[PDB]
């Protein structure tokens with residue numbers, strides 16, 4: 451478990467003053483100052499001496515300087531070739547990618563004066579608050595949904611855990627609503643999106659931080675996807691994402707991809723045991739969770755559609771992971787289909 455407060459409060463590379471300048475440096479395209487800071491960092495710090503929390507915060511801070519350079523069109527590790535050993539040492543300690551993710555940008559990013567930010571645009575706050583709210587709640591919902599596999603539908607503990615998970619997933623809904631109300635789609639495409647492009651590090655390419663990196667897909671795999679669609683595009687996105695996750699989430703995701711999902715296994719229990727009143731309540735509680743997922747994916751799809759429109763898309767047709775809104779349409783159709791299947795099983799009652 452990575453406690454966010456213990457990471458957000460760190461400044462292991464003494465960059466707090468620099469991050470008050472960074473929005474202005476990025477505005478004036480001052481690539482010399484960005485590159486000079488990367489060079490100073492590799493000479494000023496023995497990263498092998500860092501604790502885990504220090505290395506996570508360093509990844510957060512160094513990652514944002516790197517993404518700023520990449521935003522100008524320069525591969526930062528090709529320009530500062532000593533970065534590669536530095537980043538490699540850091541990722542040995544974190545056992546995470548040598549690059550920042552949504553985790554670094556949201557929950558590990560401090561609130562207030564020290565908040566790390568690429569730009570001066572307040573639309574940026576919409577992305578930061580979006581993932582900073584979404585991630586902790588989704589993580590609690592993962593712990594709770596994981597316990598459902600080992601409870602009976604007829605146990606009120608089942609229904610109560612699923613309800614808790616639905617409440618915690620609502621944090622993803624609150625997160626995307628913060629984005630819808632603060633982030634203008636046109637300012638996103640033209641001012642924010644360019645900071646989330648891929649960076650070549652040790653001969654492979656790491657996508658930038660993205661909303662898709664909140665572990666919502668982990669909820670999906672345990673809850674409905676399981677091992678049921680082996681060749682889908684969504685299982686390929688998840689495949690590519692497992693090792694971007696914090697280590698503690700990786701076994702949950704891997705085992706869930708290799709097992710039947712909760713809803714599939716609870717469908718079997720339902721149509722084979724004595725269907726009582728607690729059992730309907732328990733099955734009703736799984737549909738509640740799914741319906742919360744839709745309360746996220748429906749407005750998310752609209753937001754992505756206004757942003758990728760001809761008028762609004764700027765220079766991009768994809769998200770940071772290389773997909774169009776078609777991918778969102780497919781994840782959301784998958785979820786609508788589970789809601790239909792659950793409502794079918796319940797219709798007699």
Ligand code: HEM
Nearest residue numbers: 580581584625629638661662754757769770771772773781
């Ligand atoms: C202007 C704002 C946004 C746009 C244009 C946008 C668009 C997209 C796009 C194009 C994808 C496809 C995957 C990829 O290529 O990376 C995607 C995936 C995803 N994004 Fe966003 N997004 C926005 C804001 C957010 C926010 C704030 C969050 C979370 C708080 C979020 C969460 C997700 C998730 C969870 C996925 C994976 C698909 C799913 O589970 O439905 N997005 N988004």
Ligand SMILES: N[C@@H](Cc1c[nH]c2c(Cl)cccc12)C(=O)O
Nearest residue numbers: 577646659660661662769770771
């Ligand atoms: N969710 C979209 C747009 C996006 C890029 N970076 C983000 C961040 Cl860092 C937070 C929230 C959303 C986004 C994507 O995954 O590329």
